Write a protein that binds this ligand. Structure first.
Ligand SMILES: O=c1[nH]nc(-c2cc(Br)c(O)cc2O)n1-c1ccccc1F
Ligand SMILES: O=c1[nH]nc(-c2cc(Br)c(O)cc2O)n1-c1ccccc1F
Lengths: 209, 209
């Protein structure tokens, strides 16, 4: 049922760096996840031009931001192309090994953490605000899977028999106790306006209560 | 045999806007092309994680900048994934319609031309400095093709008979007479340092002669 995998040494080092480096501009995690969501939506939209049946799993191409103060979670949902089990095992669809190597070299040369997305490892900026990240995903060519990691050098992959999503990716951020500002409506609106104003897909910020 | 194609209407409008709008900050074209090269390199790097044989066409993942004052050309070469004939043609079709339309709307609302890359049409910033653009490309699943356009609403596609490149994309900018500063070593170095200082792949600026 649950398979446990060790992260390669470079990715584990990047995750420890993201967690342990003092860096106040944490809000960039949201631009990074929305950017990944936009890329995944572009991929399914492209594939649908030659094969319209690729949208049988859902025609709407959108991004939803779901805060939950009770669970202390911020969920980013997209109806993009999704990820296969193999993509999840490939460090949640990243070029994590070569990307980390190049990003560490850039940091040593004076680059800042906000440039993480240029190295194909933008997803890991989620650990600036989350103690645990759960990735629920459904690709047309595979079953629905749940990827999960609290860092610490390992991640798990299991088949998600739960609520079917049709197609796409759900990123569930289990926020650190001191990062609850990212659950507030006015904070999320401010970040979206600042860093993701020209995203080519509708972004819906859900209300609570 | 040369095939002639019409640009998607919105791209033809964007190209005329890029060519006719007064905009002094032309140097941003380099950042956009290097960004495209970086994305294409990410794609081949990702694909090789599951299939290492995808690097049989070349293991080195890099970007080369080649100025030629004699030919008045600036060439951007990458060893990325490359483009098939279908991609090469269809990139200028219906897929680019929304991003182009959204960019032209953003411009009407006060956005500036330098934001082109946020709309997935950064390639067309090449027409800020070039009177003609030639794109030589080689994808693992197809033959080598040459795309070309001097704008005016059409582009051509033909099989390339010149140097086979193994794998990747070559963007040849036939510079406007008044844009020859982009052939000078100190100008290219200054632009790379300013806009593309921390790319995930090595950038080599070739010396002339
Ligand atoms: O493809 C695909 N599918 N899905 C996906 C995702 C992921 C993530 Br981490 C997130 O957050 C979201 C999403 O949507 N994708 C991608 C994109 C971009 C990059 C890389 C990759 F993997
Ligand atoms: O994929 C692929 N392959 N190749 C390519 C290219 C292009 C261009 Br325009 C340039 O300049 C460069 C390169 O390299 N690609 C891409 C990227 C980005 C975007 C879109 C697309 F198509």
């Amino acid at each position: 049922e649950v398979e446990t995998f060790a992260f390669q040494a470079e990715i584990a080092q990047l995750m420890s760096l993201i967690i342990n480096t003092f860096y106040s501009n944490k809000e960039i995690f949201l631009r990074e996840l929305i950017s990944n969501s936009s890329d995944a939506l572009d991929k399914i939209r492209y594939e649908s031009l030659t094969d319209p049946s690729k949208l049988d799993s859902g025609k709407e191409l959108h991004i939803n931001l779901i805060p939950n103060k009770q669970d202390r979670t911020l969920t980013i949902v997209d109806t993009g192309i999704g990820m296969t089990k193999a993509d999840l095992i490939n460090n949640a669809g990243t070029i994590a090994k070569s990307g980390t190597k190049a990003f560490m070299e850039a940091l040593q040369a004076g680059a800042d953490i906000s440039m993480i997305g240029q190295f194909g490892v933008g997803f890991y900026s989620a650990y600036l605000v989350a103690e645990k990240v759960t990735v629920i995903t459904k690709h047309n060519d595979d079953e629905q899977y749940a990827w999960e990691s609290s860092a610490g050098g390992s991640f798990t992959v299991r088949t998600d028999t739960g609520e079917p999503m049709g197609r796409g990716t759900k990123v569930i951020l289990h926020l650190k106790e001191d990062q609850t500002e990212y659950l507030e409506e006015r904070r999320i609106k401010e970040i979206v306006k600042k860093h993701s104003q020209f995203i080519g897909y509708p972004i819906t910020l859900f209300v609570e209560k």
